[PDB]
């Protein structure tokens, strides 16, 4: 299973958090299996339904 | 005390914690399923027997 490089997730600037517009407190909860994220949503399938 | 919103959301917030220690997080999660007794064990064993019988029938 894929894993995240610590050099980029964890640091004084969280580079992964900067790119993805999140926070390290809102990334450790995910790449360490504490909370889910919504990978993608269906926009039209929700607009008509 | 226990009712009137003092302890319920208290329990929900206490459970909903960062749990930095990995063993601590695993023990927190394992504290979610109640223990079982003999009748429950034999009932679930019957269910598994039915499931494997149905799998054999599918095969």
Curated annotation (Swiss-Prot), chain A:
<comment type="subunit">
    <text>The RNAP catalytic core consists of 2 alpha, 1 beta, 1 beta' and 1 omega subunit. When a sigma factor is associated with the core the holoenzyme is formed, which can initiate transcription.</text>
</comment>
<protein>
    <recommendedName>
        <fullName>DNA-directed RNA polymerase subunit beta'</fullName>
    </recommendedName>
</protein>
<comment type="function">
    <text>DNA-dependent RNA polymerase catalyzes the transcription of DNA into RNA using the four ribonucleoside triphosphates as substrates.</text>
</comment>
<comment type="similarity">
    <text>Belongs to the RNA polymerase beta' chain family.</text>
</comment>
From Swiss-Prot, chain B:
<comment type="subunit">
    <text>Interacts transiently with the RNA polymerase catalytic core formed by RpoA, RpoB, RpoC and RpoZ (2 alpha, 1 beta, 1 beta' and 1 omega subunit) to form the RNA polymerase holoenzyme that can initiate transcription. Interacts with WhiB3 and probably with RbpA probably via its sigma-2 region.</text>
</comment>
<comment type="similarity">
    <text>Belongs to the sigma-70 factor family. RpoD/SigA subfamily.</text>
</comment>
<feature type="region of interest" description="Sigma-70 factor domain-1">
    <location>
        <begin position="20"/>
        <end position="54"/>
    </location>
</feature>
<comment type="function">
    <text>Sigma factors are initiation factors that promote the attachment of RNA polymerase to specific initiation sites and are then released. This sigma factor is the primary sigma factor during exponential growth.</text>
</comment>
<protein>
    <recommendedName>
        <fullName>RNA polymerase sigma factor SigA</fullName>
    </recommendedName>
</protein>
């Amino acid at each position: 299973a894929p894993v995240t490089h610590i050099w980029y997730f964890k640091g004084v600037p969280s580079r992964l958090g900067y790119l993805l517009d999140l926070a390290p407190k809102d990334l450790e909860k995910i790449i360490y299996f504490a909370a889910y994220v919504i990978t993608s949503v269906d926009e039209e399938m929700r607009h008509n339904e | 005390e226990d009712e009137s919103e003092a302890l319920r959301q208290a329990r929900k917030d206490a459970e909903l914690t960062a749990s930095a220690d990995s063993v601590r997080a695993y023990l927190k999660q394992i504290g979610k399923v109640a223990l079982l007794n003999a009748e429950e064990e034999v009932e679930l064993a019957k269910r598994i027997e039915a499931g494997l019988y149905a799998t054999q029938l599918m095969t």
